[PDB]
Design a protein around this ligand. Structure first.
Ligand SMILES: CCCCCCCCCCCCC/C=C/[C@H](O)[C@H](N)CO
Ligand SMILES: CCCCCCCCCCCCC/C=C/[C@H](O)[C@H](N)CO
Ligand SMILES: CCCCCCCCCCCCC/C=C/[C@H](O)[C@H](N)CO
Ligand SMILES: CCCCCCCCCCCCC/C=C/[C@H](O)[C@H](N)CO
Ligand SMILES: CCCCCCCCCCCCC/C=C/[C@H](O)[C@H](N)CO
Lengths: 113, 120, 218, 220, 220, 218, 220
């Protein structure tokens, strides 16, 4: 019904330093949103790292990775991370929600490193 | 801090309407905000609604995935997501994601997820 | 001297808004029975005198369980004793053709009303040596000892406005000022901590002495 | 004694805002006819007297179906009997060069207007023993028994403002106060529950007695 | 009798805010000329009299194409006839050291101004039997028949404030009240529908009769 | 006749808010030097007369580069000539125990102040035939020709309030009204376009004639 | 001459709101002791005179560490010396049946109060040559030299309102105006920079001379 598409298809990195993201929401209401899960293949799921599209990003993880970052531009976007090695080659994706800041339906599309 | 566990991922009959539980880590009960997940096998992950029965998100609550989104039972203390379990569609895995304070509201720690086998 | 005794009078002592209730909504409605003796700081002040007669200024500060404010329409309704109580999120009693009601969003400044002195007697009383009814007084009837009927001011019920179910959690905090106060017959103040709302019973195994004791006398 | 009889007068009894309508938008416009006898608490009060003459204070509290408030521009328009009704979300009748109209967002405090007494007779009447028209009165014409024409105050139509289609759902709640009230000829109050809006018909298989019955006559 | 004739006077008949323009921004600026005869309900009222003299109260209700309100800073600017028009989103004419201007967000309540009677003649006129200029009047010059120069009040240009390009769509709705009105020489009212803004031309193949015709003369 | 000459007087001609500056923040602070002769429409009006004496009403309209408004707390500070300038986002000069300051949110209506006539002379002057200092006047010193010292009103510095770095971009627009105006010695108006802020120099290769020329004389 | 000396008086010199504290919340509550001599610009002004007597206007500007504003309910509470301090996010001292308190959102305009002159002496004093208590004065007791007890105005504690833990960070900025000021006994101003809050001690290895020195005496 009401979707969004993060559109890097494959990050395809040779083991290095720099990489970026973009989620691009298209929701009905446009003041509240926060995003970004983790989804490791092997085992359980970190996440929780919120970028408010309009104002303050991150109510970040003060522990685990703090190398997750925030975004800008008024239009809805989320952005880069750091230089991780062969562990944490995972499949990252945004989440999206109905009314207000808890995790709801709308975290549709993924991306593979 | 410590790991949220699930129950054993197991199976159901195409008309049985059987619950699921996701037994707590041990710190707190019912103050956190429960979230239930359903993914279909092409890595499409569509989220099912919130807190205690506060589960009726944007059109959903409907294919009997999330049907009877229930409240807690306080025995395993993170148990709801009762459904109808229709014939041969609800093949998925189901994560519960509750917060533990410092991971405010959103996602503290998950389970490994319960596969629901509708295969009859 | 010219030391003024203005700000030690009875009216200036009571005109401070103290907390009286915390109402939580973890069906989207509550029926909070009225009892304004559930919080110890205002209760120790009001139980200095036996009889008190006053008006009040109630103030309803409403937020989520962690202080966040989201746009959510609410409705408070004061229910007098005898009126039909609400039973669901949308009963017939929410039409409010007789009862007063306040409609205020959570994002607005907190609402204020000014209730009058509405007791059938001449003044409120926090102490009542007697039983309200007649008849036999056996062992199983001792809930109503010290329960005067002219203090029960009915209930106070809040809800979320819509006919669906809202996804937010509500904690209401009510504060009460006291205006135009007249008091009578001062009493000894309380030293033991409080245990219930309706009776002065105390922990009999922990007699807290008033004065912090010392070692010697000289 | 010095017991006051001020707050038992006729004016103080009716000046309380009671619910009169719930208007829902599940094309983004409705044409709600006017009938203020659809909710039982205000209806039992107003049908104590036969004739009543008053002004009013209407109040429109608008939200989503679960009390959430989103920024959405609305427009209410009072349509007198005879004026052209709106037909779509953007008809020609929304220009409002003659009809009064209120433009208010959903995020604002609720709007208030003060309508006057606008009936052709001397007072409103909730009871009318008679037919409005002349002619034959056969069986198929008995919708209009007890329908006086000088109470139909036209309709009241709301919409969302834009020419596109808004994605939000609207439930309006209207409350009416009564000011400067004069009444006449008090009637016996109602005990049976209400069934329709236009007639006093009751459930004939369930005669609810007024007094809750007891067992004997010599004991309570 | 004591029937009042207060609310049928000339001042009470015109003091209702009617729609006069819809300004849409699907470069982020428009230069809307000012023609207040483009909407049929206010136009049929104002063309009852020949000459009219009044002040006005303009009101600008601004939203997205579906009634949603987002925080966006706007700027309206009234341009008198002769002033330099704006050409881009940030021209030199947006400095407004001479022209009046309103800065208002989309989230605020709608803005209101009170323009005075600014015509060089004694009153406005909606009818002008004549040509504004001298000279030859051949076939190709008949755009200006019935175009009086003392009604063109310049233009009215809006924009989004920033020097970048905003991602939102704007639909402005302007409403005009009429205060301190004096009229002269009433005319027959219009029955055919309107076709253009500058001339009374009508559809010659569809003569809409005024009265809805019936079948006979001895029965209704 | 009864033609009124009220709205052609000197006070009604100048009391219109014209743009005087655009301040952009693409460290989250700027130190905008004061010069109100950088925009041509108000400058052509104010340079009609030689000397002018007035108060003013400044208005600060602040938004993002595309008109969007996000909540963001700002702070403006008027710095008189001689006061310590701010150097960083959080210097010691932002305490403002002496300088006036405005704290306003980007979401609020735009702020307004009313500055008085603060010049050491009797009136401002837009023309000054002379040098401000004494001494030798060789070729390399000709920046200060026509620079009177009693027009420099210090600077005007804005910032974002927090000690971290805000992620938003700021464009401020300042508008100035003129109240209680008295003028002296009218001058010929300008026809060539403007090139700088501090001198009347013009493009010598493009002499724009005043009247649009025609073909013949008859 | 007609040079006025109005805006150089004592009242006009002090009536400017200067920063006095920055309160940060990186359990969601703080107990900020009161000391208004921690910021050098207002401290150099107030230590011109020995004794000062005034009222004040406090102003609390609250935001997140980067100026962003989010809807979050707060509560400030002034705690007099002797009152029970709060210990947790929800202690028993937050009921405020005796202490004054302000409830304000972060999205609102900043709150303002007007405290009176609340000292037991006739005026405040920023200098106190003496010890507050009696008894022996050995080496380990020299924290209280120059600590008068009639300047400690208790503490000032803020919190987030809810019983859970809020996910936002709070930085409060407090500004203080001075109204109805009377001063006594002016002192020499300070030239060395400030080092602590409770004593005039200075860096003994860096004697900053007042005048910027030059090279010779016969040439400026
Ligand atoms: C819309 C208004 C909602 C608030 C309605 C409150 C009105 C009732 C105020 C009652 C004033 C005190 C009455 C007695 C106080 C104690 O609760 C009783 N002693 C209970 O024992
Ligand atoms: C912008 C204003 C919108 C609201 C317009 C409402 C004005 C009409 C008020 C009517 C007052 C009562 C008239 C009669 C009441 C009952 O509906 C009739 N008896 C119907 O049977
Ligand atoms: C900031 C103010 C913006 C609005 C400016 C509007 C002022 C002009 C009002 C004009 C009043 C009516 C003048 C004539 C009306 C018709 O348009 C003409 N007859 C055109 O034919
Ligand atoms: C918080 C207040 C911020 C705004 C402070 C502005 C006050 C200064 C106003 C100056 C009035 C005009 C002074 C001279 C104007 C021209 O800039 C000079 N001639 C420069 O050459
Ligand atoms: C809700 C109100 C919160 C603010 C309460 C502040 C009231 C206290 C104001 C104190 C006025 C100055 C008192 C003395 C100033 C210096 O801090 C002392 N000299 C400390 O050495």
């Amino acid at each position: 019904d009401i979707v969004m598409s993060q559109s890097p298809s494959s990050l395809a990195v040779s083991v290095g330093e720099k990489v970026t993201m973009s989620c691009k929401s298209s929701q009905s209401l446009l003041y509240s949103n926060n995003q970004k899960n983790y989804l490791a293949w092997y085992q359980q799921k970190p996440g929780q790292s919120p970028q408010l599209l309009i104002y303050w990003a991150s109510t970040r993880e003060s522990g685990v990775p703090d190398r997750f970052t925030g975004s800008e531009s008024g239009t809805d976007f989320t952005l880069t991370i750091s230089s991780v090695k062969a562990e944490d080659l995972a499949v990252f994706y945004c989440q999206q929600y109905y009314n207000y800041p808890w995790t709801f339906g709308g975290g549709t599309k993924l991306e593979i490193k | 801090e410590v790991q949220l566990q699930q129950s054993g991922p197991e199976l159901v009959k195409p008309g049985a309407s059987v619950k699921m539980s996701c037994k707590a880590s041990g710190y707190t009960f019912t103050d956190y905000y429960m979230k239930w997940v359903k993914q279909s096998h092409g890595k499409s992950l569509e989220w099912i609604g919130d807190i205690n029965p506060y589960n009726g998100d944007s059109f959903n609550n409907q294919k009997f995935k999330g049907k009877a989104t229930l409240t807690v039972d306080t025995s395993s203390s993170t148990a709801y997501m009762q459904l109808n379990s229709l014939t041969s569609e609800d093949s998925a895995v189901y994560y519960c994601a509750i917060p533990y304070d410092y991971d405010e509201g959103w996602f503290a720690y998950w389970g490994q997820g319960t596969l629901v086998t509708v295969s009859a | 001297n010219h030391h003024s005794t203005q700000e030690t009078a009875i009216g200036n002592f009571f005109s401070r808004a103290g907390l009286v209730s915390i109402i939580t909504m973890p069906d989207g409605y509550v029926n909070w029975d009225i009892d304004l003796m559930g919080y110890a700081q205002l209760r120790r002040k009001c139980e200095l005198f036996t009889y008190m007669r006053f008006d009040a200024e109630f103030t309803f500060v409403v937020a989520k369980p962690n202080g966040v404010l989201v746009p959510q329409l609410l409705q408070y309704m004061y229910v007098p004793p005898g009126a039909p109580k609400p039973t669901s999120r949308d009963s017939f009693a929410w039409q409010t053709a007789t009862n007063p009601s306040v409609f205020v969003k959570m994002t607005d400044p907190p609402a204020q009303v000014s209730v009058p002195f509405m007791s059938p007697a001449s003044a409120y009383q926090w102490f009542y040596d007697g039983y309200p009814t007649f008849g036999e007084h056996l062992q199983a009837n001792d809930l109503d000892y010290g329960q005067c009927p002219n203090n029960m001011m009915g209930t106070f019920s809040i809800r979320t406005v819509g006919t669906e179910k809202s996804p937010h959690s509500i904690t209401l905090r009510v504060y009460m000022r006291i205006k135009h106060v007249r008091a009578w017959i001062p009493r000894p103040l309380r030293n033991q901590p409080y245990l219930f709302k309706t009776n002065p019973n105390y922990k009999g195994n922990d007699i807290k002495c008033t004065s912090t004791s010392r070692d010697k006398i000289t």
